[PDB]
Design a protein around this nucleic acid. Structure first.
Lengths: 261, 261
DNA sequence: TCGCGAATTCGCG
DNA sequence: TCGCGAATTCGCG
């Protein structure tokens, strides 16, 4: 609703854009807001690129590479901006994951389990793989003071409120979100150090314990806690907000370009 | 071979001990070496415990918990030592993972694939889940200057040298370790920032970029790079070494107990 | 009982 | 071709 944001947002909703297309929409919106800056979208980053960023931090880092052409491909891609030095800086990395088919199985009156007599499927743990790409981007951005990694959760395994699903035969199945039978949210909280979910954690926090003053890279973790599908318009707003925050942290290195125009 | 280490090591080999039993063996060996100190083995840590450790770092951390009794269970468990303050400090967390059945499929002359005409199975990505528990322990140990997390890889997906497997009918299948068809080692290198694999990285490194001086928590990643099974004796030595290093970093807080005896 | 973990086959481009 | 990703069912105690 924030001017053009409202407009782009309606477009995303009208086309139920996938997270990757929403990232491309964020890039376009950024270019619109900041005509003097240069933005780009990339769907992947090579492991050699990460290693090079790591080496700049410390020569002993980023020394391993078993498969030469190895890489990562966040399903939401990556958006970057060119700084006054000509270097590309990450402003957004988005990822959307799914897990838990219970709401669909119930609506279909389809029992599950090895005996096909269960209303619910004990939730799996594949979502844990999400920590790998978060770690890869944190490493790639180790020199940065922001970490614009956003993860969108969807499914019966990421509930934040109790919901009710009615079977075809009319029987109603009540789901308690705090049930370990299905809730796998605690499998992702390590990624943002237990900070609040559904929040923009792009600005890195620094902490200490022994005159340490260490930097934390917290992913912003969002979930559609009612088991429904994500609204592309809200994903767009979340993502545009994160990206805007990236630009703020990167401000000192964008001044020259905002001037000369 | 280092005195009692040689002895315990032969015992582990003689019983082909699983990683978890090897951790218990490390605890016993530590107690033997340091009779004045108190050690313990635990097979799990509750998410409430992690949250509490996080809160001590900064009040805004460790605030989320959806399933009250949520926890983590490293298959190798955890070994801790009691410090002069009466607090338990982690000296070792071990985990062993497997992936890649090619060497077994070839030895059995069993073709694979949707058409059952392939020598090799394109490797999966489940191993990526390993990053979750590494992140959980890093968070639990955020106040520590050491991170004794050791991961042991085994399978055809973690090769570091080319090997040859002969079929029943005599046909020999040659595997190139640098092939992305099977090698998934690059899926774990983010966990130690690209530092050397098969090495003790227990002592946290500090780096900087902008007067930052940030702390890195690098997991020690070991692989049986020839596709063979792990030798429990060598796992024991690796683990005892990591644990010994933990005690060294924790030395200032163990002095009192080593004295009074 | 509830809740963590195993790690797989094959789609995709 | 090669190499990243989807996310699942059910064992286990």
């Amino acid at each position: 609703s924030q001017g053009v944001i409202g407009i782009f947002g309606d477009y995303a909703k009208a086309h139920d854009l996938a997270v990757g297309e929403v990232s491309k929409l964020v890039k376009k919106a950024l270019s619109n807001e900041y005509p003097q800056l240069s933005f780009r979208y990339r769907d992947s980053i090579k492991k050699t690129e990460i290693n090079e960023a790591l080496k700049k931090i410390d020569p002993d880092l980023g020394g391993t590479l078993f498969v030469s052409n190895s890489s990562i491909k966040p399903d939401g891609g990556i958006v970057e901006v060119k700084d006054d030095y000509g270097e590309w800086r990450v402003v957004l990395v988005a990822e959307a994951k799914h897990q838990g088919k219970d709401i669909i199985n119930i609506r279909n009156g389809l029992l599950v389990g090895k005996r096909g007599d269960q209303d619910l499927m004990t939730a799996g743990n594949a979502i844990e793989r999400s920590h790998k790409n978060i770690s890869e981007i944190a490493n790639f951005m180790l020199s940065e003071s922001h970490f614009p990694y956003v993860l969108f959760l969807e499914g019966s395994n990421f509930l934040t409120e109790n919901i009710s699903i009615t079977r075809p035969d009319g029987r109603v199945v009540n789901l308690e979100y705090n049930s370990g039978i299905l809730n796998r949210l605690d499998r992702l909280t390590a990624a943002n150090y237990g900070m609040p979910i559904n929040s923009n954690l792009c600005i890195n926090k620094f902490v200490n314990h022994k005159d340490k003053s260490i930097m934390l890279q917290a992913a912003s973790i969002y979930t559609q806690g009612d088991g429904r599908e994500w609204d592309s318009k809200i994903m767009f707003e979340i993502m545009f907000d994160i990206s805007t925050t990236s630009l703020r942290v990167l401000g000192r290195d964008l001044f020259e370009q905002l001037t000369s125009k």
